[PDB]
Design a protein around this ligand. Structure first.
Ligand SMILES: [Mg+2]
Ligand SMILES: [Mg+2]
Ligand SMILES: [Mg+2]
Ligand SMILES: [Mg+2]
Ligand SMILES: [Mg+2]
Ligand SMILES: [Mg+2]
Ligand SMILES: [Mg+2]
Ligand SMILES: [Mg+2]
Ligand SMILES: [Mg+2]
Ligand SMILES: [Mg+2]
Ligand SMILES: [Mg+2]
Ligand SMILES: [Mg+2]
Ligand SMILES: [Mg+2]
Ligand SMILES: [Mg+2]
Ligand SMILES: [Mg+2]
Ligand SMILES: [Mg+2]
Ligand SMILES: [Mg+2]
Ligand SMILES: [Mg+2]
Ligand SMILES: [Mg+2]
Ligand SMILES: [Mg+2]
Ligand SMILES: [Mg+2]
Ligand SMILES: [Mg+2]
Lengths: 121, 104, 325, 247, 179
RNA sequence: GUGGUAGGAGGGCGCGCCGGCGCCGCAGAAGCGCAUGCGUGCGCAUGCGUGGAGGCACCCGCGGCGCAGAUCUUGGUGGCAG
RNA sequence: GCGCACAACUGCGGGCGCCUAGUGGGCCGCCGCUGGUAAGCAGCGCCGGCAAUGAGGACACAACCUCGUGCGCGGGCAAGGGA
RNA sequence: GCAGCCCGCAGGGGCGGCGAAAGCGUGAAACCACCGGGGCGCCCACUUGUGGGCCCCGUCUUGAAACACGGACCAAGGAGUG
């Protein structure tokens, strides 16, 4: 189904939760680089969790790819379907969340006319 | 089809490891009757299968004997999926045909 | 480059004017943005907290020894406020640290000559039809850009005739786009007397001899500005060049008086000269392909080499002469 | 306007295809020349070695003792790591271009270079390579230190601080030495017989990023080989380390 | 006048959902994937020179998978034509992978040409024990089967050999694993 | 070529509001809960549920703009403890 | 002014200016010392380290030994080991 | 936007009733009841229960897991500005 099959190639299945976000509910899981003087994650001691680096970054051309080779496109109305008509195979289209059900009907019908794959429907 | 009909059983004894750090992609196997390093050269490149059950459904995890290990016929094998440390002490079956590092 | 002057008929060409030299100025988009930033904070009104705010207590630190933090506590007893923390920015009902003052510098100074250049370049942006449609103006129906209407624009008395006049100038889709774009603002600005936002439509620039203020100010999508005082808030609203501007003939013919011609002082603005660019031609990167430059060039190295390898089998294979001895 | 851009791009398109075909025909003519010139110089290597053996056996036909002229270069391998090095010894390993362990270079058999090798002899293993160790080191792990030249017709304008580590092709040698040397064996000959082109030939070789040796160093590698280590003058037995280090 | 530097940023075209991501790599992604798929392109596999026409071999991984058969011909895409003769051991003609044949030392004296109409022969894959349809018309397969029934009749115990399923030799050394 | 405290720098993510510019919403907005996806990461997008009227994106501009700590402040709640 | 001329080896781009932070409790090892009965004491010199240097080996272990350190994969090893 | 019926001395409960819904908007977290599922606190590996790696963060300090100090939990607020 994609034009070119891009493998997933995320360099780790790690999530990089924040340090001690397991132990404290005040510490949310969004990553903060720990800056303490004795902190075992900053010091990169063995047994500590890993910190995000440049090295974990996925490939430039594989980045932000969905369903193999596709790239997501936000759609708010039927006018957004028109620049996707020529490039059907490159983009999976996604209707925005705040689009109402009346306009989602008209997006859904024009997308199957223009042959655009909708991830919402 | 019994695995012991055509394949030689080998016990999964350890992962390839340091004293503490363990590299689980390479599994150390002790083939029965193989007791020296030159005896285990007969099994370099040979395919190996680890047979297990997931929810009662039989699975084959296939691998390749990659390198020798030590002077006592222990060989290191790399499988499709890494062997769990639960299966240490259980048997895996060493095939009599060579497979390649790309194609198990 | 000569522009037509239309009647209120909207189709008959009355005069054929030359383009004023203001509208041929090469636009320095950074300079118009730099001036727009300081012009926007000319009507910036002050805000501050009250100088008493949070400081209206007799609060003192209780000191150490009471197993409580050293923050000032509200004096007295018998109320829930008593003994609670005061005066600090981290305290509830405390004074915010670094309270806002009205002595903040609300306005920003900009050099008058540099502001006049940016007014000139924002004027030249209105004369470029790729710019005007790029900032959202629907200018398919409009005749020319720059659209200049005759000085018989002042004979329109009622705004029904003025709306009809803009209709036969092809601005009907432009005005209808602005009128339907009226929606409620998306923040807390709707509480602060800024409830409705609508888009910016046509700007009509006039002079004192063609005063069309009454007949045109109520049309949604029409702004009116005298030619003697053009702000950048009209010419690039939102720091986005290319406002759709309809000129009267009186305002258009005064552009060579307010800004003058090239190399000459402006007659109506004392000591103003139109800006001089650092380049003469347009699109100076295309000068690279001129034969004067192209003859000058040395020959670049276009040999596409193979990617090097470091593995010892490949670099033995490049020079396979090790085994010959 | 838009015409003069497009007629430029097809003018560079022709010029790219023309000088790339010229570059490939240079590569084939160089490789055809290189195959001849290796066989010519290998015969010269055999003739030089046969002349020394004939000089040596004729001396023991009489009572005499003949040792030949010792080679015009040392081969030096960095044994110790980059840590805890005093500033004099750290500087000498920089001027020998030995910036990591298991790196190998050739240094000239000079009196100043012998004193440099002596002061860092607790960090290096050095000795004498014969022609087989010289040719194995260059043909199996030999890269060129090449400065970029942005203009084809003008080789005088180039970049100073940035030197690329590229393959030791014939054309890289022909560009550095201005037509004087144009094959790898002809570069060996300036190393082997220590010509006036030695300093240019040796510096054109990137330092040999060797592997750590097979079967180990066999003990405590930091001490001297006179005490059982691997660190010092391996006088002509330096191939016993380096041949294990190449692959 | 080039308006592209002068103009406001036009977002009317394509709103990719991570706006840090570009439109689509219409140029650079073909070169990246062709480099990528050639990198995980597995190596060209060596065809072994060990098997000779009429060499008795035991299949290790197939539908049959412990059956002494005889080897006929090496086929394309790394396959090998084999037939432990269907009168003797109830094994039809098949092709498997070249490697799954463990080579035994004894070779039959088969002189017949083995260039058979392989287009419809049942190919036994590795793990599947999928129940294939029964025996077919066998135009030339009946002739070359009878030639190795002719070959097996000359050698005394060879009929029992090809009928008996393979048992692993009792391991004592790797010298004992010679076959 | 790739460690990094104090430290400096760059580029982004995020928040309130501004001038614009593209839009969305009673056929259900923000917010919230649970999922899925994207993302080295800051974070983002969607699905379902809830909700019942606003909101989003980008470019700009202003800033009381990002919290685990301060015997922090205020509020709520535990264990202790039937 | 004319004429002559590129100077041991090896390596390699270099010179200078401006603004500003942090720091100004150090500690340890080697070798060399001073005071002291000595000290995991006190005070120096040179170099290296920790501080700020992870990882491997030292049973654990700021400094010892190896050795530096993006994210992985494959190989070969170091120190150190191989009931 | 109620009190019809059954029960209760009653508070009320249950069947109902009004309304688009809410029933003095939304209703996060801490925390709790019950139910369902599962038993590393985290990271890695896989065949998910095993192995390997991990002392408590912040901080001052030559040096912190420290028998150094602050921190029960959670939300909100909270500090280089004019
Ligand atoms: Mg207050
Ligand atoms: Mg808001
Ligand atoms: Mg770094
Ligand atoms: Mg820092
Ligand atoms: Mg917002
Ligand atoms: Mg956002
Ligand atoms: Mg604040
Ligand atoms: Mg908090
Ligand atoms: Mg903190
Ligand atoms: Mg309590
Ligand atoms: Mg001391
Ligand atoms: Mg270290
Ligand atoms: Mg350590
Ligand atoms: Mg350790
Ligand atoms: Mg080894
Ligand atoms: Mg409520
Ligand atoms: Mg400190
Ligand atoms: Mg202390
Ligand atoms: Mg600490
Ligand atoms: Mg203690
Ligand atoms: Mg406490
Ligand atoms: Mg907060």
């Amino acid at each position: 189904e994609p034009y070119l099959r891009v493998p997933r190639q995320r360099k780790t299945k790690h999530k990089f939760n924040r340090f001690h976000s397991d132990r404290f509910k005040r510490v949310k899981k969004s990553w903060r680089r720990p800056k303490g003087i004795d902190n075992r994650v900053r010091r990169k001691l063995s047994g500590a969790i890993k910190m995000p680096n440049k090295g974990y970054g996925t490939d430039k051309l594989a980045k932000h790819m969905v369903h193999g080779g596709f790239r997501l496109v936000q759609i708010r109305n039927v006018g957004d379907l028109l620049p996707l008509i020529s490039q059907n195979r490159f983009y999976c289209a996604e209707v925005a969340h705040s689009v109402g059900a009346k306009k989602r009907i008209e997006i859904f019908y024009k997308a199957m006319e223009y042959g655009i794959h909708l991830t919402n429907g | 089809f019994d695995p012991c009909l055509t394949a030689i059983p080998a016990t999964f004894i350890s992962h390839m490891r340091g004293r503490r750090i363990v590299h689980p992609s390479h599994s150390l196997l002790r083939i029965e009757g193989v007791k020296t390093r030159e005896d285990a050269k007969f099994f370099l490149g040979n395919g190996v299968v680890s047979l297990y059950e997931l929810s009662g459904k039989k699975m084959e995890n296939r691998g390749r004997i990659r390198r020798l290990h030590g002077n006592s016929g222990v060989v290191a094998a790399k499988f499709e999926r890494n062997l769990p440390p639960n299966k240490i002490g259980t048997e895996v079956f060493v095939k009599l045909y060579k497979v390649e590092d790309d194609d198990y | 480059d000569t522009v037509n002057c239309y009647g209120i008929d909207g189709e008959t060409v009355e005069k054929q004017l030359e383009m004023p030299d203001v509208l041929r100025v090469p636009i320095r988009k950074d300079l118009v943005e730099d001036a727009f930033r300081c012009v926007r904070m000319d009507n910036r009104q002050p805000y501050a907290v009250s100088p008493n705010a949070g400081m209206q207590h007799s609060a003192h630190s209780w000191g150490t020894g009471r197993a409580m933090a050293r923050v000032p506590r509200v004096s007295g007893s018998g109320t829930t406020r008593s003994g609670q923390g005061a005066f600090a920015n981290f305290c509830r009902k405390g004074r915010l640290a670094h309270p806002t003052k009205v002595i903040r510098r609300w306005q920003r100074k900009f050099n008058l000559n540099a502001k006049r250049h940016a007014e000139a370049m924002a004027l030249a942006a209105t004369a470029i039809p790729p710019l005007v449609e790029s900032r959202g103006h629907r200018i398919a129906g409009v005749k020319m850009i720059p659209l200049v209407v005759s000085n018989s624009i002042k004979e329109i008395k009622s705004t029904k005739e003025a709306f009809e006049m803009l209709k036969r100038f092809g601005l009907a889709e432009e005005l209808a786009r602005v009128k339907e774009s009226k929606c409620i603002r998306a923040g807390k600005g709707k509480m602060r007397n800024r409830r409705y936002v609508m888009k910016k439509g046509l700007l009509i620039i006039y002079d004192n001899q063609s005063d069309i203020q009454k007949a045109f100010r109520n049309i949604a999508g029409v702004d009116l500005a005298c030619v003697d005082s053009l702000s950048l808030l009209d010419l690039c609203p939102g720091s986005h060049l290319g406002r759709l501007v309809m000129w009267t003939l009186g305002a258009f013919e005064k552009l060579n008086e307010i800004y003058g011609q090239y190399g000459k002082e402006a007659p109506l603005t004392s000591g103003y000269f139109l800006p001089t660019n650092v380049v003469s031609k347009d699109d100076v990167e295309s000068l690279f392909f001129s034969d004067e430059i192209q003859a000058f060039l040395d020959v670049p190295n276009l040999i596409k080499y193979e990617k090097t390898s470091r593995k010892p089998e490949t670099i033995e294979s490049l020079n396979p002469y090790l085994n010959l001895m | 306007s838009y015409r003069r851009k497009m007629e430029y791009e097809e003018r560079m398109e022709v010029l790219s295809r023309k000088m790339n075909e010229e570059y490939q025909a240079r590569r084939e003519e160089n490789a055809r020349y290189a195959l001849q010139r290796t066989k010519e110089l290998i015969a010269e290597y055999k003739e030089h070695m046969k002349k020394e053996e004939d000089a040596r056996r004729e001396a023991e036909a009489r009572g005499a003792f003949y040792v030949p002229k010792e080679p015009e270069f040392y081969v030096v391998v960095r044994i110790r790591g980059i840590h805890k090095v005093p500033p004099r010894e750290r500087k000498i390993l920089e001027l020998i271009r030995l910036k990591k362990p298991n790196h190998a270079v050739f240094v000239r058999n000079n009196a100043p270079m012998r004193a440099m090798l002596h002061k860092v002899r607790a960090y290096i293993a050095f000795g004498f390579a014969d022609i087989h160790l010289l040719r194995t080191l260059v043909y199996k792990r030999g890269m060129a230190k090449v400065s970029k030249r942005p203009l084809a017709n003008n080789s005088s304008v180039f970049k100073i601080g940035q030197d690329m580590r590229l393959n030791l092709t014939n054309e890289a040698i022909e560009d550095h030495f201005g037509g004087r040397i144009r094959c790898v064996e002809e570069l060996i000959y300036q190393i082997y017989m220590g010509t006036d082109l030695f300093k240019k030939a040796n510096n054109f070789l990137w330092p040999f990023t060797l592997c750590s040796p097979r079967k180990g160093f066999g003990g405590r590698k930091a001490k001297d080989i006179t005490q059982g280590g691997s660190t010092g003058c391996h006088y002509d037995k330096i191939g016993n380390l380096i041949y294990r280090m190449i692959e | 006048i080039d308006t592209s530097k002068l103009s406001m940023l036009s977002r009317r075209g394509i709103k990719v959902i991570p706006e840090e991501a570009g439109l689509y790599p219409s140029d650079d992604l073909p070169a990246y994937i062709e480099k990528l798929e050639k990198r995980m392109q597995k190596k060209p596999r060596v065809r072994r020179t060990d098997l000779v026409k009429g060499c008795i071999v035991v299949v290790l991984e197939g539908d049959f998978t412990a059956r002494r058969v005889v080897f006929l011909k090496q086929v394309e895409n790394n396959k090998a034509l084999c037939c432990g003769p269907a009168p003797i051991n109830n094994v039809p003609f098949f092709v498997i992978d070249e490697r799954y044949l463990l080579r035994t030392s004894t070779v039959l004296d088969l002189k017949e040409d083995v260039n058979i109409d392989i287009s419809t022969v049942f190919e036994s894959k590795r793990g599947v024990v999928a129940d294939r349809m029964d025996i077919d018309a066998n135009s030339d397969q009946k002739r070359i089967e009878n030639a190795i029934v002719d070959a097996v009749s000359s050698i005394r115990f060879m009929k029992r050999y090809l009928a008996t399923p393979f048992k692993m030799p009792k391991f004592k050394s790797v010298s004992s694993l010679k076959f």
